[PDB]
């Protein structure tokens, strides 16, 4: 529990941010909240790769910049198509990280 | 829960019965306590080992609480890292029996601990 | 200090639940107030010290506080509650600040806009100035891009987008955006257009005069 | 009931100095700290200045420090904020709000009870509008005011007789600091060549009163 | 947080405390770190006869 | 011992935030810094409100604002003046509040 | 220090003498050196302190101990009135393994207040 | 941090221990004995107790 | 987003240690940058990913990160280290906000200053404007309000304030109050006035004159 | 050596149009996103537009969007950014930044490498300084330069033989869009009427040379 708990403590608050903060970028009908989300979300992975592993962020703070950019364009409707091939991503990194701790 | 207990039994008396000597053998009581100590809450995830850790030392030739301190320390030290953190926190709970209980500690050779984790991570990985 | 409100604007239909987020830049230990400004009017205010209400209010209104992060949360939305809502901080006397101002509309399915395009009128180029006009009838959401093109060529910095609010029958907007030009100016090209990028269109569309 | 009310607001040159009173009726200005906030046209709320009668403190703005100078008078319960030196960027609806003394609940009210609000607008010249039409299933036309100043400004079609599908935009103040709004409305086009519509335009503050026709 | 913390330390404890009440008597004894249960057919009497001998050392 | 630490846990680093910045005023020679300072300083001290003793602080915070405004004026040789007595009323509370806990 | 322990047994005994709700003077005195020294040696040095009570009447061994440990462990006046809660469930907790008040704590902090 | 809650722990034991190798209602008075025969009786007892 | 940037100025002698505190509104995990920007050049970069030091500046320059506070430490000021400091996040290539700039100011034992009025000359007077001064000699702090009493009655909004920098051999301000009035207006009064109010004067004083 | 040099600033009427171009050497743009970033006179930086060359993308500022249009020519080596409709707000020191691209190292450099910076000033009219002497009551006397532009205008006394306290305050921009500075010298009143001061002015833009004498 302790060593479980370890890692919960670290790593847990910043995978809470990007799956809260996906959800809203499937909700959101605006390019005003779609950019906003993927701030936070960008600011999560940031942190995250702070605490292999490191290299499977870059990709995904990649993806996130490609779908920013969609977002900052004025396409809405391409930035939540661009962010549903960033939730594969990210569910990988949660499987590959649960196993490790 | 009580299905996997049943089937522990037949297996550990199994492991028993023809077991080679002088090789490990898997710890299949440690496997099961961190599979009830993990979804579980804390307060409950210790008392659930402690019981389990009871059970082993009734069932097993050998004095009371020698296994229930470990598997008690193994709960609490406890998806990788945290199981070799747990393995490694059982055997705290040993030393710590023998050297409260005063007694000389067994012979053991490197193969019997390492032997040990890596049969039980077998186990514990599908679960 | 800095008081920072999101989202700037949301839509949600009558009885939908609404989460409108405040984030102080420092501690204001429990000092955060909302209000509620219908369009036109004076303020009212709704929640004091970020957690209580203030009496006299419907009782759907709610506040909350977590840490340095504030919340504003209404349980369903009645046609009463559509108006702009305020984040403030009253720390002390002299330091209160706003928030940007999160504002609730109406929702409705997509609706593709009607472009039209005028050209100046003869009277005005006597004048010296002129103003083409390009039109957006009955169309939803509120945003959409007008680009002014000149022979193929982008314009920028002399165009004016004035969008009225949601109509009281369909909740559409109207967006009209006039590009500005001198009578000498004017003369020079020949072709102009307005392309329109919306949702609801599945292409942009360029209507288009040339003189 | 309490309520507060303010007075003063109008055209002013810029560089020209106004001045604004709130008349509180219902209570005492001893008793509460009166603030002043403005709002920009179309922006957000922003604190302005405030005077706490009972001690004599005053604090303003750092954006408008220097300039605005606010006093209080218990024996005429008013308040008054006088303005100097207004610049483009002061024009603003300036509300009267109203806070408690600590301790105690009161204080944390914050601003309960609030002003009407008046409209200070900075100006260097009033002129009429000066309406040109626009020429054109469903056709739009319409009749474009450019360069009027200042607000408001009605636009009816055909003295109010056709009022289905009329849209009026909100002005725009342009660069050159006249307001400037279009109205449109759409018409069926096969009555488009066959009943003359009319565009009147109201302008108070300038007695200018144009009516518009629009022809295809 | 305070609780399980403080349980973790109650539980041991009564560990402990079986472990001294239930000593073999007789000096010098070998342990077996081992977790080897006994066989399934002999645990009917297995547990009978163990959980006797840590009854009759443990009332007084 | 996990009494007392409870105690510490709830109010201490509010009574952290109040004597670091009280250092920060004698030492600051502008009025910028000492309204900035007392800033931070009355937020704690509601901060701290919220966990007769409560009466205490509506005098902590009274004198915190009469500092305050005297420090707005830009007066920061009376605010420092003035800040040293509300030293003493903020040390009474910690006496207070350790035969309490 | 020490001086306190050596009037703490006569005045004990002095009370025991004279009594038909006692003070629990043992309890003030491991709380004080539980209080100022850090939570390894206060803990420590309460489990000797109870023993020594323990040793002195006619109890079972370790009784007063684990009572003493635990109200260590608990623990001003909030704390004092959860540290003397604390040591009377480790003497129900002892009394229910074995399987066999409020004046006591009142007098008691009548001396643990000016200490 | 993790230390003391150990010795809470083991320290606790020894008093529990102590308690079934010594063992009528108890007496949760804390009355020591009137002031030397009490220490010497009462330690004697527990070796006896020991033992068997 | 938001980033504030505190002390807006600070003092410090050669051999003291500088703390400057830069917090963020919301977080940006480390992306922090501190610059030094001499007055009248390009910024130089110190501190990059909030923690690391830019390879090419002295060691001395240190920085830190709490949760979503920032800081900028230097060990040890030199005479070559009194500039602008300015915290920027670059948390995404179009989300980049700076501080707003704190400067460092050498400090020295407080100097009252000198006060002088000078009447508007008869020259200035045949334009239309008169424009009286208020002269302020080798005073430091920078801070000292000056007030103008035309007739003993406050004037606000008409009054222009212009600071030197620090001096390079005795480290001194000097301040320029200008009031501008019309001639007309200037005509209409009879005595002018401006008030020092100062740490190094006990008392304020005030230079006038009449005419 | 990496460096970056822009040009172009200079007088633009209001509502002009200008152009800056970042002459970028050592690097190739297409490597590195190029920033613009100004800062206005006596204020704090503040960031206005960027592109990335190797992808197209490019944004803007809330307050400068859908005026200054920024593209980059990688045969060339430079990127340009075009200035629309500028206003009275955009006077500044525009610096071109330099940014790595993510992932790696160089993203976290951030603008590790700024432009010379080229200064752009919007302009009603350029007239020359009229200085007015500040007649004297230590005395101190001096010469008040009012209503010129642009800067600068250097201040010598006595063809600057005289520069002991000396003191040249920084122009103040006044209300109506012109600067207006003055310089102050300290000398004993012994020699206050022995002596005559002559305080002259140079303002290069305007090609003016006023030689005021100041009298007590």
Same mark, same amino acid.
């Given at each position: 529990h302790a060593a479980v708990a370890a890692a919960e403590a670290t790593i847990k608050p910043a995978f809470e941010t990007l799956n809260d903060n996906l959800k809203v970028i499937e909700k959101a009908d605006n390019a005003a909240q779609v950019k906003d989300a993927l701030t936070k979300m960008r600011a999560?992975?940031?942190?995250?790769?702070?605490?292999?592993?490191?290299?499977?962020?870059?990709?995904?703070?990649?993806?996130?910049?490609?779908?920013?950019?969609?977002?900052?364009?004025?396409?809405?409707?391409?930035?939540?198509?661009?962010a549903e091939q960033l939730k594969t991503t990210l569910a990988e990194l949660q499987k590959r990280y649960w196993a490790r701790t | 829960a009580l299905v996997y207990l049943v089937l522990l039994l037949f297996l550990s008396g199994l492991l028993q019965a023809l077991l080679p000597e002088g090789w490990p053998a898997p710890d299949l009581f440690l496997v099961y306590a961190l599979? $009830?100590?993990?979804?579980?809450?804390?307060?409950?995830? $210790?008392? $659930?080992?402690? $019981?389990?850790?009871?059970?082993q030392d009734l069932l097993g030739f050998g004095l009371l609480g020698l296994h229930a301190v470990g598997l008690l320390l193994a709960a609490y030290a406890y998806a990788l890292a945290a199981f070799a953190l747990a393995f490694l926190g059982k055997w705290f709970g040993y030393f710590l029996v023998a050297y409260w209980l005063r007694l000389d500690l067994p012979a053991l050779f490197p193969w019997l601990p390492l032997g040990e984790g890596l049969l039980s991570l077998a186990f514990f990985w599908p679960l | 200090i800095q008081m920072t409100q999101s989202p700037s604007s949301l839509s949600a239909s009558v009885?939908?639940?609404?989460?409108?987020?405040?984030?102080?830049?420092?501690?204001?230990?429990s000092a955060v107030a909302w209000y509620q400004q219908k369009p036109g009017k004076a303020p009212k205010l709704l929640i004091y010290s970020a957690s209580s209400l203030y009496s006299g209010?419907?009782?759907?209104?709610?506040?909350?506080?977590?840490?340095?992060?504030?919340?504003?949360?209404?349980?369903?939305?009645?046609?009463?509650?559509? !108006?702009?809502?305020?984040?403030?901080?009253?720390?002390?006397?002299?330091?209160?600040?706003?928030?940007?101002?999160?504002?609730?509309?109406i929702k409705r399915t997509v609706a !593709?806009?009607?472009?039209?395009?005028?050209?100046?009128?003869?009277?005005?180029?006597?004048?010296?100035?002129?103003?083409?006009?390009?039109?957006?009838?009955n169309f939803y959401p509120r945003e959409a891009k007008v680009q002014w093109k000149v022979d193929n060529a982008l314009q920028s910095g002399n165009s004016q987008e004035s969008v009225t609010e949601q109509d009281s029958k369909d909740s559409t907007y109207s967006l009209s955006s006039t590009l500005t030009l001198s009578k000498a100016d004017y003369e020079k090209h020949k072709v102009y257009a307005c392309e329109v990028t919306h949702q609801g269109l599945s292409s942009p569309v360029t209507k288009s005069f040339n003189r | 009931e309490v309520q507060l009310v303010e007075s003063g607001?109008?055209?002013?040159?810029?560089?020209?100095?106004?001045?604004?009173?709130?008349?509180?009726?219902?209570?005492?200005?001893?008793?509460?700290?009166?603030?002043?906030?403005?709002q920009a046209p179309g922006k957000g709320l922003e604190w302005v200045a405030y005077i706490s009668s009972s001690s004599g403190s005053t604090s303003y703005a750092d954006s408008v420090k220097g300039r605005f100078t606010i006093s209080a008078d218990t024996s005429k319960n008013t308040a008054y904020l006088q303005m100097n030196s207004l610049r483009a960027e002061d024009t603003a609806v300036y509300y009267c709000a109203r806070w408690g003394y600590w301790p105690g609940e009161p204080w944390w009210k914050a601003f309960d009870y609030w002003g009407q609000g008046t409209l200070v607008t900075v100006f260097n010249q009033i002129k009429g509008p000066s309406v040109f039409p626009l020429a054109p299933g469903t056709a739009a036309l319409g009749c474009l005011v450019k360069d009027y100043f200042p607000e408001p400004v009605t636009v009816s079609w055909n003295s109010g007789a056709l009022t289905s599908g009329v849209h009026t935009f909100p002005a725009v103040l342009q660069s050159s600091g006249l307001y400037s709004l279009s109205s449109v409305v759409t018409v069926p086009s096969s009555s488009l060549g066959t009943q003359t519509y009319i565009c009147n335009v109201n302008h108070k503050p300038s007695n200018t009163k144009v009516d518009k026709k629009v022809e295809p | 947080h305070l609780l399980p913390r403080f349980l973790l330390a109650l539980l041991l404890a009564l560990g402990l405390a079986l472990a001294a009440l239930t000593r073999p008597l007789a000096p010098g004894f070998a342990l077996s770190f081992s977790p080897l249960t006994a066989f399934p057919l002999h645990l009917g009497h297995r547990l009978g006869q163990n959980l006797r001998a840590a009854w009759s050392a443990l009332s007084a």
């Open positions: 999560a992975a940031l942190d995250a790769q702070k605490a292999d592993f490191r290299h499977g962020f870059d990709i995904l703070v990649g993806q996130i910049d490609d779908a920013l950019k969609l977002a900052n364009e004025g396409k809405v409707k391409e930035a939540q198509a661009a | 599979w $009830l100590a993990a979804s579980r809450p804390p307060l409950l995830g $210790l008392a $659930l080992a402690f $019981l389990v850790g009871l059970l | 009885g939908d639940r609404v989460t409108i987020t405040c984030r102080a830049s420092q501690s204001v230990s209010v419907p009782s759907r209104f709610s506040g909350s506080r977590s840490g340095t992060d504030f919340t504003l949360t209404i349980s369903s939305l009645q046609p009463e509650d559509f !108006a702009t809502y305020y984040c403030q901080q009253y720390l002390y006397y002299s330091l209160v600040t706003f928030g940007q101002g999160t504002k609730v509309e !593709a806009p009607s472009v039209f395009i005028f050209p100046p009128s003869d009277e005005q180029l006597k004048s010296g100035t002129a103003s083409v006009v390009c039109l957006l009838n | 607001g109008g055209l002013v040159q810029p560089g020209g100095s106004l001045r604004l009173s709130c008349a509180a009726s219902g209570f005492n200005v001893v008793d509460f700290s009166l603030h002043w906030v403005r | -």
